[PDB]
Amino acid sequence: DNFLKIERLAENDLPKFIQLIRLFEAVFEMKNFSIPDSEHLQKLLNQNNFYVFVALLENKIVGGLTSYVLEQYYSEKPLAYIYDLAVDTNWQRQGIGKKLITATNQFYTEKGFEEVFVQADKVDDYALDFYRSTKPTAEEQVVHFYYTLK
Amino acid sequence: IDNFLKIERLAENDLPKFIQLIRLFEAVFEMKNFSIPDSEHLQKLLNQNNFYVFVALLENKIVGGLTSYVLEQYYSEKPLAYIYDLAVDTNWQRQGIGKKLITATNQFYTEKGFEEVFVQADKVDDYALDFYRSTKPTAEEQVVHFYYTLK
Ligand SMILES: [Cl-]
Ligand SMILES: [Cl-]
Numbered sequence: 001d002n003f004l005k006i007e008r009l010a011e012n013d014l015p016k017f018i019q020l021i022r023l024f025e026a027v028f029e030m031k032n033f034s035i036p037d038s039e040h041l042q043k044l045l046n047q048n049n050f051y052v053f054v055a056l057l058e059n060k061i062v063g064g065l066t067s068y069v070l071e072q073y074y075s076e077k078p079l080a081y082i083y084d085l086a087v088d089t090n091w092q093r094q095g096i097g098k099k100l101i102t103a104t105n106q107f108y109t110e111k112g113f114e115e116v117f118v119q120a121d122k123v124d125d126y127a128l129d130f131y132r133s134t135k136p137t138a139e140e141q142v143v144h145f146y147y148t149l150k
Numbered sequence: 151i152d153n154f155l156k157i158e159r160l161a162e163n164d165l166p167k168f169i170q171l172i173r174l175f176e177a178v179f180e181m182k183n184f185s186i187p188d189s190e191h192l193q194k195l196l197n198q199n200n201f202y203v204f205v206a207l208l209e210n211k212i213v214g215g216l217t218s219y220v221l222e223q224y225y226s227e228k229p230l231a232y233i234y235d236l237a238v239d240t241n242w243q244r245q246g247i248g249k250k251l252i253t254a255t256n257q258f259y260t261e262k263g264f265e266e267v268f269v270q271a272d273k274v275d276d277y278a279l280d281f282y283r284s285t286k287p288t289a290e291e292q293v294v295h296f297y298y299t300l301k
Contacts, residue, residue, distance in 0.1 A: 040227050047222065068219075071201070072195075073172055076187050076188075117298070120294050121294075122294055123292070131294075134298075136296040136298050137298050141295075142270050142294070144269075145271070148289075149256065149259060
């Protein structure tokens with residue numbers, strides 16, 4: 001569409017950041033969520049290893065992703081890790097997620113990165129077929145382990 | 151072996167050990183036509199406050215190690231830690247070394263008040279798959295890894 005706009009957040013974009021987090025809360029159906037203080041979120045937004053992309057309709061965030069820079073020891077060309085990606089259920093399928101991926105990969109290409117990667121749950125068929133629609137270089141079935149700390 | 155082994159988190163002046171671990175990675179992962187980055191680059195990476203390396207030592211020889219990245223969260227003030235690579239010397243595999251590395255790493259991030267540490271293994275790597283399972287993770291999950299090689 002011509003009205004939709006993809007933008008990368010900056011220092012004074014905390015309100016848009018919070019709006020995206022609220023979208024994440026909604027789409028991911030997170031329970032009993034308590035958003036961190038704005039002081040914390042502001043400092044994170046200011047990190048040079050963290051970049052947020054959103055899809056906007058006028059003032060309304062209808063989609064977004066978060067990404068982390070991982071400097072490599074194999075190469076002087078860093079990696080980018082897309083951690084979260086969501087599209088508002090009322091705008092799911094508008095080309096939004098593709099536009100976000102394209103913007104993100106172009107951004108890291110300009111910065112001389114080697115590779116961008118992202119994970120989707122095996123049971124999440126909507127995301128699974130979405131990422132395949134973005135034509136990634138490759139996909140690999142893997143297993144994710146995590147240790148909840150005391 | 152346990153009373154010979156040393157598990158440690160690398161310090162600022164441990165670039166030689168870092169390079170040794172990278173070389174171990176090159177061999178264990180069977181990386182082809184690898185060219186190690188300049189030492190200035192590796193030193194700066196080692197010194198990053200969001201990157202920590204844990205190694206296993208016998209005298210001066212690295213026999214195993216892992217690399218970890220701190221990921222500050224927007225869901226919580228408690229960060230995440232991402233274990234990116236883990237390898238053990240093929241002649242020393244499955245003698246508790248990998249378990250000790252995971253234990254040390256998780257203890258470090260637990261003390262720092264992190265929410266969780268996570269790590270991934272290939273579906274076909276049953277060596278790795280049931281190693282991590284032997285470490286008693288809180289949960290495991292089937293996922294698909296997508297990547298985009300940039301021009
Ligand atoms: Cl809240
Ligand atoms: Cl930039």
